[PDB]
Structure 1
Amino acid sequence: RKQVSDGVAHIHASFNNTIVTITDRQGNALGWATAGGSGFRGSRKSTPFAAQVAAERCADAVKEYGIKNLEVMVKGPGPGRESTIRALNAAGFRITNITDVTPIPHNGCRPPKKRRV
């Protein structure tokens, strides 16, 4: 076991799902939870409520580490991004800093074709 001050939490917010993972600052995984794993299937999985419950599940799953003064980084355009940080605060974790990062390609390569619906 270990007690980690200044651990890093990763938020990946797809349109269809949300993933929460806790790693040491060098990216070594400590614990992870998910909306789909929270007892959700299909369209329910994109709701911000699902993200909140997923964040609580992640926090509880990793309690055995003495994690304090958390840092949170968020990626993706999906919904419920803010809800996860609210959850980690509510879980009791102390949050020092918060950052956004999402890959931009600088016109790298071709995306799929437009959707006629």
Structure 2
Amino acid sequence: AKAPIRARKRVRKQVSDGVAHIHASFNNTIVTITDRQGNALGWATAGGSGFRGSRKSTPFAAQV
């Protein structure tokens, strides 16, 4: 019967507020979330979000 709702296993750390850094360049854009005291909390990128080619340096790819 059962068909699932929860998106992941239960939350970890839990910090309420953070800093993000967007390193935007002519070939690729990297978005990296951190804590105020300097800790990566996760990242994703245009190239890792499955664009490649010329699409890798586009505002639409940056969004995704």
TM-score (normalised: structure 1) = 0.42
Cα distance in structure 2, aligned partners of 1:27 and 1:48: 27
Report the CA distance between 1:6 and its aligned residue.
2.5
Cα distance in structure 2, aligned partners of 1:36 and 1:26: 28
Report the CA distance between 1:5 and its aligned residue.
2.4
Q: Does 1:51 align with 2:62?
A: yes
More helix by share: 1
TM-score (normalised: structure 2) = 0.73
Q: Deviations over 1:44-93 (max 9, x none)?
A: 101111000xxxxxxxxxxxxxxxxxxxxxxxxxxxxxxxxxxxxxxxxx
Cα distance in structure 1, aligned partners of 2:26 and 2:46: 12
How large is the Cα RMSD of the aligned pairs?
4.5
Report the CA distance between 1:42 and its aligned residue.
2.0
Q: Which has the higher contact order (CA 8 A, sep 6+)?
A: 1
Cα distance in structure 1, aligned partners of 2:57 and 2:38: 26
Instruction: Give every structure 1 segment of 4 or more consecutive aligned residues whose post-TM-superposition deviation is greater than 6 Å.
Output: none
Report the CA distance between 1:34 and its aligned residue.
0.2
More strand by share: 2
Percent identity of the aligned residues? 100
SS in 2 for 1:2: coil
Cα distance in structure 2, aligned partners of 1:8 and 1:16: 23
Structure 1 stretch displaced more, 5-14 or 28-37: 5-14
